[PDB]
C-alpha cells in the first residue's frame, strides 16, 4: 500500500513532450541566516546540510552547521516527503564548510576544515584540509563507530592542484567506488587555456582573455577553480581528484553528479560567462567528460557585466545555483528551477524544458520573491516521475524544500 522510492528507472510509457501553455504543474506542500545548503537523494536516503549564521546572511557569525541523513518515504497520502532520523553537529562550525554520496549502509559526506573561512574568499589563508563524515543510513543502538564516523584523510593525490576540496552537494557511486564533487585551487600560473577556444565571435564588446580571467575569482586571484569529482575506493584513503575536461570550460561552481536512468548526469552552476544552464550525461566518470546539453533557452541571473541570457566572453564572477535533472532520455526533457530576472535573484520557476523549448512552467512564488540557491532532485515513486527541490524563498531565512509531480500527459 506504500510505494517504494527508487532511482528513476524503466521506460517512460506515458510522457508529455509537446509545448503546453496551461498551468498543469503544482508546487506541492529572527536575525539568523541559513545558507550553503545541501540535498542529496539516492535510493530513498536523503541528506540535508546548511550553514546557520547570525545576522548577516553572507558574512554573519557561523552559528552552527548541521549534517544529517533521513529516508525518503511517502507521506501516507501518496505525496512524497522528507523524513529524518539522524542529525550531527561538528564542534566548531567555522572550520567545517562546503560539504554527499550514497554507498550501502553508510552515507559519506566529504567536507573541508577551514578555520580562516571560506577557501574561495582567501585561498592562501586555507591550508589543505579534508574530512569525511559518515552517518549510518539506519540508526543502530550500540553501533559504536558504525553509526557516526569522523575521518580526516592523511593525504590526497591532487596532481597539479595544490589544494582541492568538496564543492558540490550530491555524488555518485560507480559500483563500490565512491565519488564526491570537488573544486580545484590550481595556481593561476599553472593553468593553460588557448584563447582561440574562447568564442569571441558574435560579440563585439568581448575580449579573448575574458575566458581565462573569468576563471579566477578576480583577474588578480591566486588560483583558478575547476569543478570536478573526488573519488574514494571504499574497499581499500588516497583520493584522486577527477576534473571536467576542456569542453565548455567554466568556473568551478558547486556541482551535482547524479545517476538518472542508471547513468551519471552532471550539473554545473553558471558562475562564469555562460549564463545558460549547462547539463548532460557523463560518458566516463573515472576520466571526466560530460556531453553538455545544447540548452539554448534557460539562463541564470547575473551582474551588469554578465547578465541573464549573455553569450559574450566577459570577465564576471557572479551567478546562482540552478540545477536540473533528466526526466527522460529520448525526449531529453529536463526538470529544473531557474530564476526569472536578468540581474537580480528573484522570480524562481520550476521549469520542465528541453534543448530548444520549454514544455511547461509554474511560478514558485511572486516575481519579487528573493531566491538564489536552488537545489533540485528528481526521483521515481511507482511509475510516476517526481522531483523534489529545496529553495530559499524570501520576502527568518531558511531554505525549504517542496516536491512537484511531473505530468505524463500533454493535455
Amino acid at each position, epitope marked *: 500500500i506504500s510505494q517504494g522510492v*527508487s532511482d528513476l528507472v524503466g521506460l517512460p510509457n*506515458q510522457i508529455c513532450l509537446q509545448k503546453t501553455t496551461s498551468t498543469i504543474l503544482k508546487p506541492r506542500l529572527e536575525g539568523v541566516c541559513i545558507t550553503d545548503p545541501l540535498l542529496a537523494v539516492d535510493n530513498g536516503f536523503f541528506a540535508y546540510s546548511h550553514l546557520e549564521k547570525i545576522g548577516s546572511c553572507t558574512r554573519g557569525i557561523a552559528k552552527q552547521r548541521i549534517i544529517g541523513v533521513g529516508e525518503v518515504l511517502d507521506r501516507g497520502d501518496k505525496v512524497p516527503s522528507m523524513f529524518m532520523t539522524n542529525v550531527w553537529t561538528p564542534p566548531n562550525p567555522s572550520t567545517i564548510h562546503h560539504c554527499s554520496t550514497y554507498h550501502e549502509d553508510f552515507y559519506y559526506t566529504l567536507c573541508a576544515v577551514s578555520h580562516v573561512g571560506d577557501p574561495i574568499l582567501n585561498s592562501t589563508s586555507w591550508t589543505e584540509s579534508l574530512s569525511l563524515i559518515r552517518l549510518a543510513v539506519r540508526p543502530k543502538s550500540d553501533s559504536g563507530d558504525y553509526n557516526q564516523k569522523y575521518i580526516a584523510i592523511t593525504k590526497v593525490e591532487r596532481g597539479k592542484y595544490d589544494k582541492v576540496m568538496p564543492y558540490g552537494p550530491s555524488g555518485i557511486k560507480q559500483g563500490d567506488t565512491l565519488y564526491f564533487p570537488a573544486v580545484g585551487f590550481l595556481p593561476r600560473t599553472e593553468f593553460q587555456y588557448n584563447d582561440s577556444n574562447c568564442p569571441i565571435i558574435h560579440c563585439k564588446y568581448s575580449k579573448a582573455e575574458n575566458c581565462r580571467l573569468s576563471m579566477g575569482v578576480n583577474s588578480k586571484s591566486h588560483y583558478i577553480l575547476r569543478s570536478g569529482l573526488l573519488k574514494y575506493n571504499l574497499s581499500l584513503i588516497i583520493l584522486q581528484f577527477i576534473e571536467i575536461a576542456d569542453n565548455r570550460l567554466t568556473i568551478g561552481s558547486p556541482s551535482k553528479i547524479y545517476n538518472s536512468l542508471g547513468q551519471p548526469v552532471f550539473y554545473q552552476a553558471s558562475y562564469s560567462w555562460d549564463t545558460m544552464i549547462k547539463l548532460g550525461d557523463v560518458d566516463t566518470v573515472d576520466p571526466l567528460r560530460v556531453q553538455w546539453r545544447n540548452n539554448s533557452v534557460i539562463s541564470r541571473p547575473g551582474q551588469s557585466q554578465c547578465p541573464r541570457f549573455n553569450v559574450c566572453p566577459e570577465v564576471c564572477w557572479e551567478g546562482t545555483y540552478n540545477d536540473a535533472f533528466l526526466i527522460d532520455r529520448l525526449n531529453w526533457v529536463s526538470a529544473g528551477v531557474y530564476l526569472n530576472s536578468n540581474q537580480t535573484a528573484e522570480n524562481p520557476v520550476f521549469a520542465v524544458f528541453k534543448d530548444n523549448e520549454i514544455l511547461y512552467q509554474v511560478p514558485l512564488a511572486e516575481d519579487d520573491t528573493n531566491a538564489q540557491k536552488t537545489i533540485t532532485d528528481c526521483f521515481l515513486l511507482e511509475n510516476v516521475i517526481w522531483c523534489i527541490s529545496l529553495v530559499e524563498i524570501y520576502d527568518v531565512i531558511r531554505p525549504k524544500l517542496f516536491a512537484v509531480k511531473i505530468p505524463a500527459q500533454c493535455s
Partner: antibody
Amino acid sequence: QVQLVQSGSELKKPGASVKVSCKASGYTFTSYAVNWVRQAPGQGLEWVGWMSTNTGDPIYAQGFTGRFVFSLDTSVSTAYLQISSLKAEDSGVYYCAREGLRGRAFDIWGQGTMVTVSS
Amino acid sequence: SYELTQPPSVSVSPGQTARITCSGDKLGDKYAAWYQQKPGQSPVLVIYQNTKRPSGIPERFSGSSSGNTATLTISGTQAMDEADYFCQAWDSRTNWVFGGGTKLTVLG
C-alpha cells in the same frame, strides 16, 4: 485478479505468419506498458520487446531484425505480435507480461501460447 | 550487450539455506528482480528491488546485492522451492536484460 491471457497452441509451417493476441483483464491497460518474452523449449526466459499502451509509439525490442512487429487496438485493449516468416528457431512459449514497476520487475505474466514451427 | 551470469546448478538438502548469486557488471546500482518458474508454469516474481517482497508471498525469501553480485537466500528449502530460478535487471543502455536461470536440485 489481473492476468494477460493469449490464444491457444498454433502450428505454423516455415515462412508463414501467426498472430498471437494478448488480452488484459482486471487492470487498466493504459497505466502499465506490456513486455514480450519467449521461452525456448528447455531454455531460459528471453525479453523480446517493450510496447507502450498509451503512446503506441515505436515499441522497443531487443537487438534483431524487423521480423517481429508490435501493434495494439486500445478499444479492445489487446497487444499483438506479428511474426512474419517464422523460423524453426523462432519456436516456443511466448508470454506477454506487464512492466508493473518500470525498470524493477514484471508483475503479471501470461499463460503463454506455444507457437510451433513444424515442418 | 549486458549479461546476468548465474550458476547453472545449486544442490541443497532440506532445511539448509540455499544461495544463488547473479553476477553482473555494477549490479549495486541496477535494481534486480527474481523469478521462479516450476516446470510447466508461468514465471512468478519473488524478490525485487534487491530487498522487497511482493504481496502475498512467503517470507522465507530474502535478497541482497553488493558490488558485482546480487544474492537470494532461502531460509531452509521446502518441497515447493524445487524450480528454476531467474534473475533480471533493467539497463538503460541496452534493454530489460534477463539472467540465464539456475537449477535448484533439492534432495529427499
